Amino acid sequence: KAETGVLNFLQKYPEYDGRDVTIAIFDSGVDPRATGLETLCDGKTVKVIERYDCSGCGDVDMKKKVTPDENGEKAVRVGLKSFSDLLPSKVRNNIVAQAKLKHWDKPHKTATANASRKIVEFESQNPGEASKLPWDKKILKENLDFELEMLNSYEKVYGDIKTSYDCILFPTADGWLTIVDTTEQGDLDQALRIGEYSRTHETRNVDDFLSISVNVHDEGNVLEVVGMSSPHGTHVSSIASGNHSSRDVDGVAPNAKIVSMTIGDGRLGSMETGTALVRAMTKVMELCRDGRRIDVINMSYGEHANWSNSGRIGELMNEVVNKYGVVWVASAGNHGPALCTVGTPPDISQPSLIGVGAYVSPQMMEANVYTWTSRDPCIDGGQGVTVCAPGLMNGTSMAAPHVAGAVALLISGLKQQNIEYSPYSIKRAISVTATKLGYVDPFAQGHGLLNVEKAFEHLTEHRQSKDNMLRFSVRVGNNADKGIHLRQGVQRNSIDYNVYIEPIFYNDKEADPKDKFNFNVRLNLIASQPWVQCGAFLDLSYGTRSIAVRVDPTGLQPGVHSAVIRAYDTDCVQKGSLFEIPVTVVQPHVLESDQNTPVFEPASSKGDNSVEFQPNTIQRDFILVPERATWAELRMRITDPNRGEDIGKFFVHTNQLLPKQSCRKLETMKIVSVGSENESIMAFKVKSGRILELCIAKYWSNYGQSHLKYSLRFRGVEAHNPNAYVMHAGRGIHKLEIEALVAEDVQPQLQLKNAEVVLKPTEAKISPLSATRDVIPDGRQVYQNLLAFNLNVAKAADVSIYAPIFNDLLYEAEFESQMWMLFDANKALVATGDAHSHTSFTKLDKGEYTIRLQVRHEKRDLLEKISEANLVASFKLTSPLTLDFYENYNQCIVGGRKYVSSPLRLSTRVLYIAPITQERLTKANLPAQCAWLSGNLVFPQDEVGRRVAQHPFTYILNPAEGKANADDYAESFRDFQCSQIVKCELEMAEKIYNDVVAAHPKHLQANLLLIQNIESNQLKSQLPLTFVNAQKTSPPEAGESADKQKEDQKKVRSALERIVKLADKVIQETDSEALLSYYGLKNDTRADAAKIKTNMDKQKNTLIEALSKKGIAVAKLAVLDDCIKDSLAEINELYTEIIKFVDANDSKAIQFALWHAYAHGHYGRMYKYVVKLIEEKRTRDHFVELAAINGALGHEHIRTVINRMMITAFPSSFRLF
Amino acid sequence: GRILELCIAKYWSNYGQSHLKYSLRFRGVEAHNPNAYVMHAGRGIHKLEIEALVAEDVQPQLQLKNAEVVLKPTEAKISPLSATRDVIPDGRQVYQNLLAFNLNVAKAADVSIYAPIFNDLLYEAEFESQMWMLFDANKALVATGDAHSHTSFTKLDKGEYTIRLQVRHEKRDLLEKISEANLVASFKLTSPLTLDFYENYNQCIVGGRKYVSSPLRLSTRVLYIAPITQERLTKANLPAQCAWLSGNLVFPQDEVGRRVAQHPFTYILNPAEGKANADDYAESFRDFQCSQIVKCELEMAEKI
């Protein structure tokens, strides 16, 4: 719809519906089944011919082959008779969740139809006593309280459970058949049986509200699932194409064929990845080379860059446009209004992409999420916006799609009228044809609005011109910029520029028939305005030619001024301009700085200034910031009388451009509410000697014409000494030489909020990737450099992970990849990041993690330069360390009188910060091994100036670090023996042990050691229920052998229980319990003869282990005899004697309690225990036991969930890249 | 932005009345970005936002000349001194806080030793004492410094040294604030590490095309320095345990402007870090025995 503004009349070439042409949709994926993309106008042919997920997010590792010896993953296997070409006999298998192929904003997919049986919660209450102290039912209330907690705990956790399915595929003749276990249970042939989408099983199969497609690579080593779930990608294709057969809701070219290519990575959910794009272009390139040309691409997608002159992703774009003649359409961006805000796509290393601004016709008056189109100065100087149309996820306001479809229409007849064209001749044709809209912001568009039928005229005519196959490379001033952009800068002098203009033959200069050497290129150049000057003639016939141009800013009054140098073919001057040289000058207001703070007020007309706003008005004042200015204050109020107390809403976009930095590094975008009554005030950070743009637009008003009265006041105060903001803990006292701008109440505050540690690469393997997928034509194999890292959390905290050398750059980077994945100790996935990850904080539990970093490129010897690249882990500190300031050095070194707040006018004030004391550091519980602490240093007292005028601060840490007797030999020999008896064959140890005890009777430790051995050679370490459940069935072996193996267990626990009693009797606890709790007298009167805990705490640490090991042993026996009931007495008297010492939750006894709890039927307590263990260790065994606990409780909705965690939390392999 | 005094006098002339024709020309070019002149080895690629004063041929050079290590106080004993000598009337006993340190030279090199918090101040300091004495492994005296010792370089042979630091004052509870005071040892590096510059970031990360000298007028030029490779560091034979390297960063090409327009630069380093058989028992038992026969009474060892 809305299709009329650009054309509805070229359709009077009705046979130009989009025939013989296929568009490429780089986006969040599309949905074929959706009404409109079902078929092309043929009413029969399928439109969405292909669809990939180039991010690698949908990969599955089908590496494990297993023959269907089912008869003749994780759970079971059942599926044959389906030996349909399953040659040669085998099958591949893997596991994969799909919570990522799905936009993370669909957790509602988690519906509790049969999950809310938790609600039946039995809170057994207390008709007993009044306060906390009953004996001995305190355990009962514990057990009960703990069940309720457990239930609630699972309630809080439900939505976090991701489910992973089983995948199967084998090589039939019809291609490849893949099976997804929908019905997890019945492995029957009643599940998803999808075929290769490409090989024409181009059909969606569903789980529910989640359609799936499939591709196969690496000879069947990888499965690629494709997720439709992402609206953006669909509507984009619905505007470009969309056969509805009515020219009312139809796309712009219903006959055009679409190929969805998800370039968003679900793991980043859902950002673009260098890799993704590289793969997308790779495919395109491949398809073109192989007869199936794709003629147009459409990117409603993209971010910003820190430069244009460099980048691999960009340089590849210039190859898919120059070599494969693909017309690449991309949205200018949704980052308006403040100009110089065009983001990458299309701001790359050359004007090879068609940027499309977006405009809303007055025909559409309408009222968080608005987004102005980005304006086209372009920060290189060049021009990003090529045209406009009605309308990471560049919304596009979906008009890029429009244009894309429009470009399809032109290429319909351009090819069936047999017209030789280029991606240049097309972008060139549309440009010098469009209608400049005098009611739309000059910068927001570029060559006004697309006019198709007129642009086709241009192409039909001049079709016999060689200019159509020529590109004109325009690069400025040795940096190869694509435009002249004066914005430093107080432009009072004129300046000269050396522009290099070079002709480039469409593809390249290769014989047959190209390139017809020396295509005599003579052209003239006309300046758009008087203040720009250059020659009027230039001959390019013999290659690259330089040309000087002079800009005279002297006459230009403050504000932005634009101009262009159009060039024409001397001969046919009617071909319109061939190319343009974009000049754009910014003349800043200067603010005198002497009496009080510098202030900017718009010029006053007829008394009061008060700028007038309308639904269109965009006021952009360019101001050169005063030196010493740290922040700014924006005051504004609505003038025009009455209006009452109603509020107006204005959009403020501040934007400063810093040396080789993206526009997003000093920018603010705040929707400010303004009233007539009192003055509104917003503040923003500011940089001294550089131009600042104060762009103000009108959001929504309740009106349609207001009058704003505003001003900018400049304030500032900071440290001028060289290396302030960075302080080394071992370089003595730190100083800050503070100078303020015309008086400021100075009152500094420094809070070190998070501690960062450096992770060095353990390994750096460079490996070739796939020869099937990752190979850019022709013969360019893409290699990966895999860097491994070890992170180690000791105490749970919010942690961010980033790679300094790669972070900050997405496009415009030398390498086409970053992406790190934080892995669990169990190979699970904990987190995953890319560019700009320093901001994302994944909260980690204690334990050892792994991090993998993958860097892609085609030149191996460049990946080698990356092999030492480190990572950084920023731990959020619970307690932000606050640093004090001092005004007198000597007062600082001793830490006496602190600094006292006071005003500071035109002088220099020196403050000091003394190194942080050692005690305050260990109490900060820093990570290992911390490198530095970081925070923000604030100067001004003004509270609002504090929230904005923040200076990155860093505090770096300094590095860490008798002639033996036959008696002595006796002690040395026992220890040598004891150290052995634990690691030997228990039949050898029983001997050794005997010799030890005979020689050293009182040496009880020998008992415990034999135990550890006996219980390591004979019986598996398993928890209560897991032990019980594992004492039944399992018939694979012998029905007889099942006794000799379980009678070996009995003998052992018997032998084990007696070994404990030996360390229980001759260690009488009664008296041993007169020093620990009966301590009182610190160090026992400091007699320094018994001030040795080493002996006492030893006699007890040995005791607890004896009691502990005994109980857990006399409990297993009870289970073997099935009589925990008529044995429960001992377990109790035994458990009640341990607690008298270190409590049950200590490693020492933690899992004798688990048995006690079991024997008492306290399934609640068991949970409370098996979580303690799950906090330190986390083993599958913990979960299977935590599952069994539920089964015994009855909750099988819970246990069904626990069985899902496991499947995913303990994968077979690390997730692919 | 500060006043400069150009004072000119007459030394000796052969005459008694001359006429001087002189002028001062001001030049300049340096990095304006905040924490330049200080680069952490693990914070990725370093950048320098260079702005020159009315045109200067810019050609930077950075030589890391000496590696400094941090010495923490092993002990910090506060002790009363003499009641006969060190007592300021009337009844003010002067106490000393004695800080002990361990320095450890592995390879002979010129070394300077200084106490950051005390160095730089002689008078006008809160405490009335510094003075550190470097002692031999044999208790001999190797060196001894005070305020402004960061400049004196005592050449040390390999071996373990001791350093004592004495801080005097009459208020004990003020000496306690000093108890954590560290020292610094600057090892002169035989081979000054020379760092390369790049004009294009991407060219820097891969270490290709280096920066090419050129004039710079009224604009901003951004250069980059990539972290030093691990190999080039161990071949620099750094001390243990080095904290940072230091040197001087130069901007202008003018050779005379280089000898004078020096900027203190610092490069901080990142932190470092089966069921035995009766046969197996036999091997384990010999080793246990052998380990003994050396430390026993030789009459017992001859048996073993």
Side-chain angles (χ1 to χ4, degrees), chain A residues 84-85 87-103 105-116 118-137 139-186 188-240:
Chain A
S84 50
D85 307 335
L87 57 95
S89 55
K90 32 201 168 180
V91 137
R92 309 205 176 204
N93 167 64
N94 194 211
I95 198 180
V96 59
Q98 292 160 333
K100 312 206 171 179
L101 332 172
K102 194 192 215 64
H103 41 81
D105 60 354
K106 185 176 277 289
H108 72 267
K109 169 67 177 62
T110 308
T112 66
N114 50 10
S116 212
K118 270 174 278 282
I119 81 299
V120 186
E121 297 173 359
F122 293 87
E123 179 188 355
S124 299
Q125 296 207 353
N126 42 219
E129 280 215 22
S131 286
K132 314 174 184 178
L133 223 279
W135 306 111
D136 204 10
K137 311 171 180 179
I139 60 168
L140 293 164
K141 268 56 182 184
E142 279 191 20
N143 180 27
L144 288 172
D145 279 56
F146 291 135
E147 289 191 39
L148 188 274
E149 296 199 3
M150 178 197 194
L151 295 165
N152 292 342
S153 184
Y154 278 103
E155 178 69 11
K156 310 192 192 84
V157 171
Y158 193 93
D160 297 326
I161 278 61
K162 314 170 184 176
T163 99
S164 305
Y165 300 134
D166 275 314
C167 290
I168 320 182
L169 84 171
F170 47 87
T172 86
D174 292 338
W176 231 297
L177 200 159
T178 156
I179 305 170
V180 172
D181 191 18
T182 309
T183 312
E184 317 159 21
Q185 40 206 16
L188 291 78
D189 307 349
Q190 311 169 199
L192 270 52
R193 324 168 75 268
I194 303 194
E196 305 174 345
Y197 198 95
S198 57
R199 197 161 179 171
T200 70
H201 190 57
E202 330 192 333
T203 289
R204 58 128 183 98
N205 283 347
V206 188
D207 317 61
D208 207 15
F209 317 130
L210 168 56
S211 299
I212 307 299
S213 177
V214 159
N215 304 341
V216 171
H217 324 278
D218 300 340
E219 296 182 354
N221 264 313
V222 189
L223 178 81
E224 171 182 332
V225 288
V226 182
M228 65 137 192
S229 283
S230 270
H232 193 262
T234 294
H235 302 96
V236 164
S237 313
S238 194
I239 275 64

Side-chain angles (χ1 to χ4, degrees), chain A residues 1120-1147 1149-1192:
Chain A
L1120 290 177
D1121 309 326
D1122 189 357
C1123 68
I1124 77 97
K1125 195 183 291 291
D1126 38 315
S1127 287
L1128 219 195
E1130 194 184 22
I1131 297 179
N1132 292 178
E1133 76 201 38
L1134 210 59
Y1135 172 85
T1136 316
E1137 189 163 41
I1138 285 198
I1139 179 59
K1140 295 194 295 184
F1141 307 87
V1142 169
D1143 72 346
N1145 313 262
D1146 187 294
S1147 309
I1150 216 299
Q1151 56 177 206
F1152 163 54
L1154 278 162
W1155 280 102
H1156 174 94
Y1158 166 87
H1160 271 254
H1162 293 33
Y1163 294 82
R1165 283 176 49 192
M1166 294 188 63
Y1167 167 76
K1168 203 59 177 184
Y1169 287 136
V1170 60
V1171 301
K1172 282 289 183 181
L1173 285 45
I1174 221 176
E1175 284 179 6
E1176 299 196 39
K1177 298 189 58 182
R1178 269 214 168 207
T1179 311
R1180 148 167 275 269
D1181 300 31
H1182 288 85
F1183 280 66
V1184 303
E1185 228 279 328
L1186 200 40
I1189 295 171
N1190 277 295

Side-chain angles (χ1 to χ4, degrees), chain A residues 25-31 34 37 103 105 227-241 258 260-264 270 272 298-302 329-331 333-334 369 371 392-402:
Chain A
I25 279 60
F26 294 21
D27 212 289
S28 65
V30 91
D31 181 24
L37 290 68
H103 41 81
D105 60 354
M228 65 137 192
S229 283
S230 270
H232 193 262
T234 294
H235 302 96
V236 164
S237 313
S238 194
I239 275 64
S241 182
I258 277 64
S260 173
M261 319 208 167
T262 313
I263 62 175
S270 60
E272 335 128 41
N298 187 292
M299 266 211 192
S300 294
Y301 233 55
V329 180
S331 79
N334 65 171
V369 177
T371 78
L392 67 319
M393 287 155 36
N394 275 342
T396 286
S397 322
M398 281 201 196
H402 196 110

Side-chain angles (χ1 to χ4, degrees), chain B residues 108-218:
Chain B
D110 306 356
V111 175
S112 79
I113 303 172
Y114 68 102
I117 41 274
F118 295 110
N119 197 333
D120 312 330
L121 272 48
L122 195 281
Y123 302 90
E124 94 264 12
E126 180 57 45
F127 304 92
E128 81 197 50
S129 168
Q130 315 180 19
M131 163 146 305
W132 52 268
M133 280 184 294
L134 176 63
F135 291 111
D136 205 359
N138 311 306
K139 299 161 194 165
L141 184 153
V142 193
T144 160
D146 201 50
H148 319 298
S149 60
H150 60 97
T151 178
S152 323
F153 279 89
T154 304
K155 175 143 200 157
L156 308 180
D157 295 331
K158 86 161 73 76
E160 300 199 58
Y161 298 81
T162 318
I163 303 187
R164 294 203 197 188
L165 199 268
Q166 182 214 21
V167 188
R168 300 164 48 116
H169 204 282
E170 74 185 28
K171 300 306 173 195
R172 289 172 303 178
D173 40 26
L174 303 197
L175 286 78
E176 286 177 5
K177 312 270 84 77
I178 289 314
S179 296
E180 289 179 356
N182 71 109
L183 289 178
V184 178
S186 182
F187 291 67
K188 280 191 180 176
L189 304 182
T190 306
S191 55
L193 290 156
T194 321
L195 282 57
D196 325 288
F197 299 77
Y198 302 93
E199 183 156 22
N200 300 331
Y201 180 88
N202 300 329
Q203 198 70 37
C204 172
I205 185 177
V206 63
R209 280 132 47 187
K210 277 78 178 185
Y211 166 74
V212 190
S213 321
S214 78
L216 172 69
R217 203 154 269 87
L218 55 152

Side-chain angles (χ1 to χ4, degrees), chain A residues 307 309-312 479 488 658-661 687 690 722-726 728-733 737 739 756 758 760 802 804-809 812-815 861-862 865-866 868 870-872 889-891 893-895 908 915-919 929-932 934 952-954 956-969 972-974 976-977 980 982-986 988 992 1013 1016-1017, chain B residues 1-2 32-45 47 49 51 68 70 72 114 116-121 124-127 173-175 177-178 180 182-184 199-203 205-208 218-222 224 227-231 241-246 264-266 268-281 284-286 288-289 292 294-298 300 304:
Chain A
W307 44 77
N309 46 118
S310 178
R312 193 188 188 272
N479 246 27
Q488 196 91 196
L658 308 182
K660 283 214 160 193
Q661 296 191 36
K687 215 299 163 189
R690 309 196 162 282
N723 290 186
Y725 317 108
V726 50
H728 185 119
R731 300 264 258 179
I733 291 180
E737 294 181 355
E739 273 165 311
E756 327 193 45
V758 177
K760 284 194 167 189
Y802 68 102
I805 41 274
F806 295 110
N807 197 333
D808 312 330
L809 272 48
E812 94 264 12
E814 180 57 45
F815 304 92
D861 40 26
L862 303 197
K865 312 270 84 77
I866 289 314
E868 289 179 356
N870 71 109
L871 289 178
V872 178
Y889 180 88
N890 300 329
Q891 198 70 37
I893 185 177
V894 63
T908 303
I916 296 184
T917 84
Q918 180 56 59
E919 176 164 301
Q929 36 214 45
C930 192
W932 69 86
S934 60
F953 192 97
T954 150
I956 103 94
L957 269 42
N958 40 38
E961 249 67 35
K963 272 67 192 75
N965 195 2
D967 292 337
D968 301 326
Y969 176 86
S972 297
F973 180 52
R974 71 163 178 195
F976 158 73
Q977 278 184 123
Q980 281 275 167
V982 64
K983 67 187 70 166
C984 312
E985 303 192 335
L986 89 82
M988 188 178 91
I992 299 192
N1013 188 198
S1016 180
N1017 301 23
Chain B
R2 309 196 162 282
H32 271 61
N33 56 328
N35 290 186
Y37 317 108
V38 50
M39 159 181 181
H40 185 119
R43 300 264 258 179
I45 291 180
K47 29 168 280 191
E49 294 181 355
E51 273 165 311
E68 327 193 45
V70 177
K72 284 194 167 189
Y114 68 102
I117 41 274
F118 295 110
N119 197 333
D120 312 330
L121 272 48
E124 94 264 12
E126 180 57 45
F127 304 92
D173 40 26
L174 303 197
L175 286 78
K177 312 270 84 77
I178 289 314
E180 289 179 356
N182 71 109
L183 289 178
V184 178
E199 183 156 22
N200 300 331
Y201 180 88
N202 300 329
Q203 198 70 37
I205 185 177
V206 63
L218 55 152
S219 280
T220 303
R221 182 167 308 165
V222 180
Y224 307 91
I228 296 184
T229 84
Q230 180 56 59
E231 176 164 301
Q241 36 214 45
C242 192
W244 69 86
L245 312 183
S246 60
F265 192 97
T266 150
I268 103 94
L269 269 42
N270 40 38
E273 249 67 35
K275 272 67 192 75
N277 195 2
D279 292 337
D280 301 326
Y281 176 86
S284 297
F285 180 52
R286 71 163 178 195
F288 158 73
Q289 278 184 123
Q292 281 275 167
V294 64
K295 67 187 70 166
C296 312
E297 303 192 335
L298 89 82
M300 188 178 91
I304 299 192

